[PDB]
Motif scaffolding. Structure first.
Motif, mmCIF file in Angstrom:
data_model
loop_
_atom_site.group_PDB
_atom_site.id
_atom_site.type_symbol
_atom_site.label_atom_id
_atom_site.label_comp_id
_atom_site.label_asym_id
_atom_site.label_seq_id
_atom_site.Cartn_x
_atom_site.Cartn_y
_atom_site.Cartn_z
ATOM 1 N N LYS A 168 0.823 -1.197 0.000
ATOM 2 C CA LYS A 168 0.000 0.000 0.000
ATOM 3 C C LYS A 168 0.866 1.260 0.000
ATOM 4 N N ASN A 169 0.422 2.286 -0.704
ATOM 5 C CA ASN A 169 1.150 3.529 -0.751
ATOM 6 C C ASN A 169 0.098 4.591 -0.612
ATOM 7 N N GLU A 170 -0.066 5.124 0.586
ATOM 8 C CA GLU A 170 -1.029 6.195 0.763
ATOM 9 C C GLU A 170 -0.374 7.555 0.642
ATOM 10 N N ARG A 171 -0.456 8.111 -0.559
ATOM 11 C CA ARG A 171 0.119 9.400 -0.854
ATOM 12 C C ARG A 171 -0.891 10.547 -0.671
ATOM 13 N N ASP A 172 -0.450 11.798 -0.768
ATOM 14 C CA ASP A 172 -1.378 12.917 -0.593
ATOM 15 C C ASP A 172 -2.333 13.019 -1.756
ATOM 16 N N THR A 173 -2.020 12.322 -2.833
ATOM 17 C CA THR A 173 -2.809 12.391 -4.048
ATOM 18 C C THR A 173 -3.459 11.076 -4.497
ATOM 19 N N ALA A 174 -4.705 11.133 -4.947
ATOM 20 C CA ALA A 174 -5.361 9.905 -5.344
ATOM 21 C C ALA A 174 -4.657 9.304 -6.549
ATOM 22 N N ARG A 175 -4.099 10.157 -7.402
ATOM 23 C CA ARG A 175 -3.388 9.692 -8.588
ATOM 24 C C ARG A 175 -2.126 8.874 -8.302
ATOM 25 N N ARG A 176 -1.380 9.282 -7.288
ATOM 26 C CA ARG A 176 -0.118 8.640 -6.942
ATOM 27 C C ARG A 176 -0.233 7.611 -5.832
ATOM 28 N N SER A 177 -1.461 7.237 -5.486
ATOM 29 C CA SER A 177 -1.677 6.263 -4.422
ATOM 30 C C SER A 177 -2.085 4.842 -4.869
ATOM 31 N N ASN A 178 -2.064 3.900 -3.919
ATOM 32 C CA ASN A 178 -2.461 2.531 -4.206
ATOM 33 C C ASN A 178 -2.611 1.720 -2.928
ATOM 34 N N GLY A 179 -3.455 0.703 -2.979
ATOM 35 C CA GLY A 179 -3.629 -0.182 -1.843
ATOM 36 C C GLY A 179 -2.780 -1.411 -2.148
ATOM 37 N N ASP A 180 -2.872 -2.466 -1.330
ATOM 38 C CA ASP A 180 -2.105 -3.689 -1.558
ATOM 39 C C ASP A 180 -2.678 -4.475 -2.724
ATOM 40 N N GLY A 181 -1.798 -5.178 -3.421
ATOM 41 C CA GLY A 181 -2.238 -5.989 -4.543
ATOM 42 C C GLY A 181 -1.158 -6.957 -4.987
ATOM 43 N N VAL A 182 -1.522 -7.865 -5.887
ATOM 44 C CA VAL A 182 -0.605 -8.871 -6.389
ATOM 45 C C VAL A 182 -0.669 -8.863 -7.887
ATOM 46 N N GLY A 183 0.431 -9.216 -8.522
ATOM 47 C CA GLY A 183 0.416 -9.257 -9.965
ATOM 48 C C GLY A 183 1.328 -10.360 -10.436
ATOM 49 N N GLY A 184 1.133 -10.776 -11.683
ATOM 50 C CA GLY A 184 1.970 -11.815 -12.258
ATOM 51 C C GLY A 184 2.053 -11.697 -13.774
ATOM 52 N N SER A 185 2.966 -12.432 -14.394
ATOM 53 C CA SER A 185 3.104 -12.385 -15.836
ATOM 54 C C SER A 185 3.745 -13.682 -16.249
ATOM 55 N N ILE A 186 3.414 -14.143 -17.448
ATOM 56 C CA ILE A 186 4.020 -15.344 -17.982
ATOM 57 C C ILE A 186 4.357 -14.986 -19.411
ATOM 58 N N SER A 187 5.558 -15.301 -19.859
ATOM 59 C CA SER A 187 5.884 -14.975 -21.224
ATOM 60 C C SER A 187 6.649 -16.126 -21.833
ATOM 61 N N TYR A 188 6.728 -16.178 -23.144
ATOM 62 C CA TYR A 188 7.431 -17.267 -23.752
ATOM 63 C C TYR A 188 8.120 -16.789 -25.018
ATOM 64 N N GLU A 189 9.400 -17.108 -25.143
ATOM 65 C CA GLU A 189 10.129 -16.649 -26.291
ATOM 66 C C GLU A 189 10.823 -17.713 -27.084
ATOM 67 N N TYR A 190 10.358 -17.851 -28.315
ATOM 68 C CA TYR A 190 10.932 -18.814 -29.198
ATOM 69 C C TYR A 190 11.452 -18.264 -30.486
ATOM 70 N N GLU A 191 12.767 -18.152 -30.554
ATOM 71 C CA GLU A 191 13.397 -17.732 -31.787
ATOM 72 C C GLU A 191 12.783 -16.509 -32.480
ATOM 73 N N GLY A 192 13.041 -15.333 -31.918
ATOM 74 C CA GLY A 192 12.528 -14.123 -32.523
ATOM 75 C C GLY A 192 11.106 -13.813 -32.138
ATOM 76 N N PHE A 193 10.368 -14.840 -31.725
ATOM 77 C CA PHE A 193 8.983 -14.645 -31.317
ATOM 78 C C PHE A 193 8.872 -14.568 -29.835
ATOM 79 N N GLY A 194 7.923 -13.778 -29.379
ATOM 80 C CA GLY A 194 7.710 -13.630 -27.963
ATOM 81 C C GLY A 194 6.249 -13.331 -27.703
ATOM 82 N N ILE A 195 5.715 -13.966 -26.675
ATOM 83 C CA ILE A 195 4.350 -13.727 -26.305
ATOM 84 C C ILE A 195 4.327 -13.571 -24.797
ATOM 85 N N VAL A 196 3.465 -12.685 -24.322
ATOM 86 C CA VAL A 196 3.369 -12.395 -22.901
ATOM 87 C C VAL A 196 1.937 -12.230 -22.506
ATOM 88 N N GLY A 197 1.695 -12.473 -21.234
ATOM 89 C CA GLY A 197 0.381 -12.262 -20.676
ATOM 90 C C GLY A 197 0.721 -11.711 -19.316
#
Ligand SMILES: CCCCCCCCOCCOCCOCCOCCO
Ligand SMILES: CCCCCCCCOCCOCCOCCOCCO
Ligand SMILES: CCCCCCCCOCCOCCOCCOCCO
Lengths: 340, 340, 340
Positions: A160-189
């Motif tokens: 969590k980051n409680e800043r003076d501004t709603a724009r620059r603030s955030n609560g707790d959260g989780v994130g993830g990503s999976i990507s795969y790269e095969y010979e010049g090709f790459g895909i991500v989610g």
């Protein structure tokens, strides 16, 4: 530039001086990028030390020094630390680091953040998982514990980051990503969701108690050719402002598309062609509104690895009757970069 | 200090820590330079890369870190980027660079900006072409395309800078300078004119829609001897403040004289003797008023190229009945510099 | 890291990126150290040049870049120059330097300022002679002109600093310290007194026209063992705030005790045990009040000289009915440091 390397510790001190100028008509208030001097410089360090054959420690800091302010009261306008984090990488087990760094959804948006001066419009700062944020602990794994070449993932915990501004603030959260790269090709989610702070909720625009952001990306990177595409969406995460009412908040929903096509000639010239469009849905009051919408044509010319110059040209497709007040004029950026 | 140099790219990381203290009587409100701790440090980089035998790319950034602020709220007071620009030099065709840099009229004022701690009073920051300004594109030619040893010129384009303050603002303008150096002798002529912004015109002092500044300089630089002189004038360009009325604006007209005489002994001691006087004419309300007026006696002692100390002493000739409130007391600066 | 060393001049460019996070319950308003991201980085330089066999010039600058701010308006929060000074050391005659540096009473408090993340509570910034202050001229002598191994002293002159804040201000004063080190043992005594400014006197808490601070220290430093203790006192020098009344000023009197015990295992682990207690006496209105009071248990693990991580745990002994509003909750800091 690697200025130090002894006893398994190597320090790279890096930076750049960018003479930059934007050309847009009027007071650039209604243009895409503004107008006038935009000169700036960067100074940062990246260190890495081999604690033993399987273990590596490392850290990085990068700062932004605006070069278009006077030496008067406004002298600090725009200055900031972009990145600040330390971490460890162990054998094939993965790396872990904590500090101000890139949100995981940018593992995807990175694909199209390749324009000479503009582009990467949806990758906002201090905006949950899409750009640089503070207080992120990130675990990354490469080649699936070394068992699957090209398969990588990452999970990231946002404090969590409680800043003076709603724009620059955030609560707790989780994130993830999976990507795969095969010979010049790459895909991500990539995907993340987080709590919104009281103040974010007290805002006029956007409604919910949880922010979300996901993006997928596809690229072909080889043979002097670079073609990339991104598509993602968000709920109550993208910041918007009604210039008329001077109202602010977040878009309930957006759908974002980014395409980029570039080629690197052997003599130094790298032409760029791109398309961007981010549209907000259900904005309280307006309905659906475009936030970003344009074609980009530009080119960078590399004198060598330390010197280059470029012209980036935005052909704004936003129209003058845009409900939020988003600008509709074109912008041309010309710049000369020295770096090390 | 040249910390890097490989593959035709050399980076010079430089800086200094200056312990400094001013001595003036009273609260130094009425003295020439003020009074008390004035400690500060500098950190900058200058890079240069050889793209090929005729072409050189280069960039530079320099920052100022005040060392006399607390670690409290005032911690950033006085900090700023002094220079930030990138550029190219091609064979004998000349160089071109863009960014925050020195206005061309300083090609002249530089002559006498040689005092240990003070001097160079007329070379104000963010004041059109006389000191450092933002958004200047500068073309410089040396040895007249290589056809005339010692003959150099420069032309400079200043882009409009509409700041929140009339003092730190400027409209578009052009400037140039021609100088010639023959065996220890050097002569320069410099000139620029620019548009004044709405806000500059909305000011109480000074009247016009165009700012001008020219200065000529003469020097003899050889045989341990340095003698230099400057004379220049300005129209609606020099910033002034009536301390009584707390009014501000620019001097309709000024006439500036600067003389400097120094000698470098072989053992490290460099005595300095100087004279400065800048007088404003036609100030709306006051008539003619001195802005700067003093004798300087001082000395720098070089321990070597990285260490030195000096005492600069200002014998203020301004008098207590100065109409603008300009201070009349003396100031003595003592300092110890380490640098690299 | 010594990035430069030629012609008797060596420059050490140093820094670190510290990923850091505090854990305290609630909004950490009532805890000891707060709560949340506390990431930051440091960048500094220390230069030293040999002017000849007996004479050395040197300078140092160090800055603090917060890594937990957004890139928005708050981006500069917490940034500051910590040190900035230059000086000379001559043979066995001693050294002299001037600039922003450590007050002499810290020659004593340094003994126990060894905790992984906390500790050194009484060594406040811009607070006369106990922490870093601006405008200090310091003379130091080692080995009593080379006549007495292990006997050192220092005298320091503090120049008036009239800041906008009573907390960050000071009048003129003098300080000194004498210490003696014999084979693992070290003892110090330090003392300073200074004038208080008008503004300091206009404050609600504390009463006098002179500030004082002395501390004595004792340590045993050898054989992987580090045990240290400090005891000092102050008059109208320690800053305090009544959170209830929102009143501020300085403690008429305080008595400070600090104990630290640590051991360095050969494999990298350095456990820490500490005790701190600073109590104010005669606070106008409250009587006697504890300002700091806790046990610390923590540990640092060094991967090597560039990489380490630690957990510092504060077992706050302050109690919830503390008259000034000083927090009573515990705090746990976890951090990962990369440095060079
Ligand atoms: C090295 C310290 C790492 C601290 C991580 C704290 C994460 C807190 O909240 C995460 C929520 O998801
Ligand atoms: C590398 C970019 C250079 C841009 C120069 C812009 C100059 C604008 O106005 C000049 C007026 O004189
Ligand atoms: C290198 C300059 C040193 C200047 C020291 C000034 C000290 C002023 O007041 C000291 C009061 O004690």
């Amino acid at each position: 530039a690697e200025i130090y390397n002894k006893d398994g510790n190597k320090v790279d001190l890096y930076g750049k001086a960018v003479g930059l100028h934007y050309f847009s008509k009027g007071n650039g208030e209604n243009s895409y990028g503004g107008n006038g001097d935009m000169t700036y410089a960067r100074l940062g360090f990246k260190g890495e030390t081999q604690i033993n054959s399987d273990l590596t420690g490392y850290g990085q800091w990068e700062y932004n020094f605006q070069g278009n302010n006077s030496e008067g009261a406004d002298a600090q306008t725009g200055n900031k630390t972009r990145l600040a984090f330390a971490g460890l990488k162990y054998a094939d087990v993965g790396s872990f680091d904590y500090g101000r760094n890139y949100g995981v959804v940018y593992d995807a948006l990175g694909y199209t953040g390749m324009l000479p001066e503009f582009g990467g419009d949806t990758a906002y700062s201090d905006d949950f998982f899409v750009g640089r944020v503070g207080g992120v602990a990130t675990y990354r794994n490469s080649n699936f514990f070394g068992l699957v070449d090209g398969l990588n993932f990452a999970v990231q915990y946002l404090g969590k980051n409680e800043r003076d501004t709603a724009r620059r603030s955030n609560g707790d959260g989780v994130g993830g990503s999976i990507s795969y790269e095969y010979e010049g090709f790459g895909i991500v989610g990539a995907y993340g969701a987080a709590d919104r702070t009281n103040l974010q909720e007290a805002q006029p625009l956007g409604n919910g108690k949880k922010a979300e952001q996901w993006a997928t990306g596809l690229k072909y990177d080889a043979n002097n050719i670079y073609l990339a595409a991104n598509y993602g969406e968000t709920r109550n995460a993208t910041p918007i402002t009604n210039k008329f009412t001077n109202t602010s908040g977040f878009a309930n929903k957006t759908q974002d598309v980014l395409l980029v096509a570039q080629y690197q000639f052997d003599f130094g010239l790298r032409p760029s062609i791109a398309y961007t469009k981010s549209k907000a849905k259900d904005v309280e009051g307006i309905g659906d509104v475009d936030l970003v919408n344009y074609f980009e044509v530009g080119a960078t010319y590399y004198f060598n690895k330390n010197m280059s110059t470029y012209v980036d040209y935005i052909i704004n497709q936003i129209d003058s009757d845009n409900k939020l007040g988003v600008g509709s004029d074109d912008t041309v950026a010309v710049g000369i970069v020295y770096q090390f």
